[PDB]
Amino acid sequence: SGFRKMAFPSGKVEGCMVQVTCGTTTLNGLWLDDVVYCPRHVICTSEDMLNPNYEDLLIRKSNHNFLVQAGNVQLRVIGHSMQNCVLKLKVDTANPKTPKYKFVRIQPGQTFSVLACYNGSPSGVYQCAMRPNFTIKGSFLNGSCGSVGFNIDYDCVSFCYMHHMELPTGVHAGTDLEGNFYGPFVDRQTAQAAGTDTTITVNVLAWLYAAVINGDRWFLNRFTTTLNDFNLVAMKYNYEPLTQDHVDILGPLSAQTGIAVLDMCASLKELLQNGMNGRTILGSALLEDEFTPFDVVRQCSGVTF
Amino acid sequence: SGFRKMAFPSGKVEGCMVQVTCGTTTLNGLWLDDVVYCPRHVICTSEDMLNPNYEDLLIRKSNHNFLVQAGNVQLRVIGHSMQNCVLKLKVDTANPKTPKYKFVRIQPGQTFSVLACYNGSPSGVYQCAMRPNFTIKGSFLNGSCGSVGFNIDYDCVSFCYMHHMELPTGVHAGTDLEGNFYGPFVDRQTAQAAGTDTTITVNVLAWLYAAVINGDRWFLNRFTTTLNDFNLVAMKYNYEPLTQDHVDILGPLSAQTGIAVLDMCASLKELLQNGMNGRTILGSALLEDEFTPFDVVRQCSGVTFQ
Numbered sequence A: 001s002g003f004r005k006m007a008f009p010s011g012k013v014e015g016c017m018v019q020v021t022c023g024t025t026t027l028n029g030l031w032l033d034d035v036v037y038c039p040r041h042v043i044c045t046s047e048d049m050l051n052p053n054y055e056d057l058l059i060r061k062s063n064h065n066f067l068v069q070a071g072n073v074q075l076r077v078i079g080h081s082m083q084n085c086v087l088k089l090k091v092d093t094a095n096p097k098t099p100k101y102k103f104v105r106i107q108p109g110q111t112f113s114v115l116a117c118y119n120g121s122p123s124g125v126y127q128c129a130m131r132p133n134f135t136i137k138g139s140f141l142n143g144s145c146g147s148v149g150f151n152i153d154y155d156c157v158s159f160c161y162m163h164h165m166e167l168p169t170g171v172h173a174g175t176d177l178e179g180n181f182y183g184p185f186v187d188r189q190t191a192q193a194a195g196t197d198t199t200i201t202v203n204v205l206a207w208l209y210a211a212v213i214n215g216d217r218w219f220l221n222r223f224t225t226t227l228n229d230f231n232l233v234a235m236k237y238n239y240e241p242l243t244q245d246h247v248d249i250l251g252p253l254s255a256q257t258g259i260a261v262l263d264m265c266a267s268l269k270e271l272l273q274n275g276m277n278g279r280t281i282l283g284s285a286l287l288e289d290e291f292t293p294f295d296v297v298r299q300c301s302g303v304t305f
Numbered sequence B: 001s002g003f004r005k006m007a008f009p010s011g012k013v014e015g016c017m018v019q020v021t022c023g024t025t026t027l028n029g030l031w032l033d034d035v036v037y038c039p040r041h042v043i044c045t046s047e048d049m050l051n052p053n054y055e056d057l058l059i060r061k062s063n064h065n066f067l068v069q070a071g072n073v074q075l076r077v078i079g080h081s082m083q084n085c086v087l088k089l090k091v092d093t094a095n096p097k098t099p100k101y102k103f104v105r106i107q108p109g110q111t112f113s114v115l116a117c118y119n120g121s122p123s124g125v126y127q128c129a130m131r132p133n134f135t136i137k138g139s140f141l142n143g144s145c146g147s148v149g150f151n152i153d154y155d156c157v158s159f160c161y162m163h164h165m166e167l168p169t170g171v172h173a174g175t176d177l178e179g180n181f182y183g184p185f186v187d188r189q190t191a192q193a194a195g196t197d198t199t200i201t202v203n204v205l206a207w208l209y210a211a212v213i214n215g216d217r218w219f220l221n222r223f224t225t226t227l228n229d230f231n232l233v234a235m236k237y238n239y240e241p242l243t244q245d246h247v248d249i250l251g252p253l254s255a256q257t258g259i260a261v262l263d264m265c266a267s268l269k270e271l272l273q274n275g276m277n278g279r280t281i282l283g284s285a286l287l288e289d290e291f292t293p294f295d296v297v298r299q300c301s302g303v304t305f306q
């Protein structure tokens, strides 16, 4: 029993973290086989960040301008190029600890684990969700750029996020490992802001199923609703629309508990309209939206890697 | 910016997890050097759990009654002994991935990372606090016994917890790595239950300091308190007494924010009286007590957002 915000074990990713320094900037890189991936803004000074021409800034750098350190060992850079907002440094040594991996781009609402890193050394691991506004509510300080997000499936690490920046509200933005930004953000020092966010409805429903699996059932009721009626309430409360694909993805949790998704939607509609009346769900006074349906099944069934 | 329940990177502990089977029971063990540590109840059947005599159950076992598997490799058991509630299986091969480590028995209020495992394989990692009633609020299913808790401050793994059981309220109990239970619990199926729990006051104050470092002061007020008056109030809300040792450990956070510890105590007394009035603190609508002062310093900026 119990239900915690659980991260994936991070060992396979720890063995990939290195430090990358270019000029006065030091950040983290991901070393897979003979390539080190990191944010391309490592090549910029503060003045360059105001209006960077990355192609011209990179033409001016040589391989020797990048110092890459894996623990106490210097890896020699033998080539460099950019793929979108990611710099790729070819090194003379392949990482002997490279796991089986893929680069995957995720959608808003999906969760992943972050291995927060400073100076190429892993510091901590936590789980989070990609918000509907494409930001992440991470925990990052200066020097954390290049820290990555991932999921595991069996023995394969799926890397999905590389950290690039903090926005004025203290939330974070970054790219996939092919260097494509999540959200309408750029790697330039200009006015940028997180857009208005919404709550991930399918995830709140998944977490209400986790609460029923754990014995918290006070919010269940005799009513059902329709997908149309529920979506009119979701829009009013700044919740994402629930689609038939979301109803299908909640299928396994609905089958395990015996509670139809539209029956659980009637519970959520009443919680949105009335509040919790001084009660909690799984120890929380807020409706939690950073567990996907698969996260609940994994945790409640003890899936291992 | 941001503030999350942050666990230590688990790799150094993942390389120590193994599966131990005795009879029909399979659970996890921790392989360090040439010893595998696991809960001694691996030798019990369900009926043995009502009134087990562990000395009598163990004398009937040979080394070859223990099967230990590290990934796809079987490790040969060459000796066994019991230390309190932990079985120590000597194996013929030392773990080549043994990290620098120590064993530490912690106090209530201290936090640690848990690597929850099944069949010797990791499922996930999360942070826990040792509650004042000597339980932990984990996430563990049958088969998770032998999963461990640890901290990794300064590249050395300090193992502080080994999981043994779930109590009737769904909370968890276990031992240190010398096999002594935290709390009054026993590895026997008795009517034992978690005592009434209390809130870890020093941790709530540390987390209010984290909120100020991260830029929020709305909950402060113009008052101060004596330590005794604060404790008389706090105990009425089932908060643990705050000691002078707790006030000392909050010193660095007080220095960084310019808020005297007894002035943050006056803020907490007012938050217990008023609630948050629709606001949140670090994303929470409830007062959080599973971050220690050391955990706040570990995670937060050393520069306050004034």
Ligand SMILES: Cc1cncc(CC(=O)N2CCC[C@H]2c2cccc(Cl)c2)c1
Pocket: A041, A049, A140, A141, A142, A143, A144, A145, A164, A165, A166, A167, A172, A186, A187, A188, A189, A190, B001
């Ligand atoms: C506190 C913190 C936490 N996470 C990351 C950072 C890094 C950050 O925001 N940087 C670094 C260069 C200047 C700035 C930036 C500005 C604009 C676009 C980008 Cl990609 C980057 C800081």
Ligand SMILES: Cc1cncc(CC(=O)N2CCC[C@H]2c2cccc(Cl)c2)c1
Pocket: A001, B041, B049, B140, B141, B142, B143, B144, B145, B164, B165, B166, B167, B172, B186, B187, B188, B189, B190
């Ligand atoms: C769901 C779950 C989560 N965590 C661990 C367990 C294991 C558990 O509670 N066991 C196993 C043997 C019988 C029982 C027990 C009973 C009494 C004392 C001890 Cl040490 C152990 C179960």
Ligand SMILES: [Br-]
Pocket: B105, B106, B107, B110
């Ligand atoms: Br301690």
Ligand SMILES: [Br-]
Pocket: A283, A284, A285, A286, B284, B285, B286
């Ligand atoms: Br909450």
Ligand SMILES: [Cl-]
Pocket: A026, A027, A142, A143, A144, A145
């Ligand atoms: Cl940086």
Ligand SMILES: [Cl-]
Pocket: A221
């Ligand atoms: Cl009703």
Ligand SMILES: [Cl-]
Pocket: B026, B027, B142, B143, B144, B145
């Ligand atoms: Cl078990």
Ligand code: NA
Pocket: A220, A221, A222, A223, A224, A263, A264, A266, A267
């Ligand atoms: Na209903």
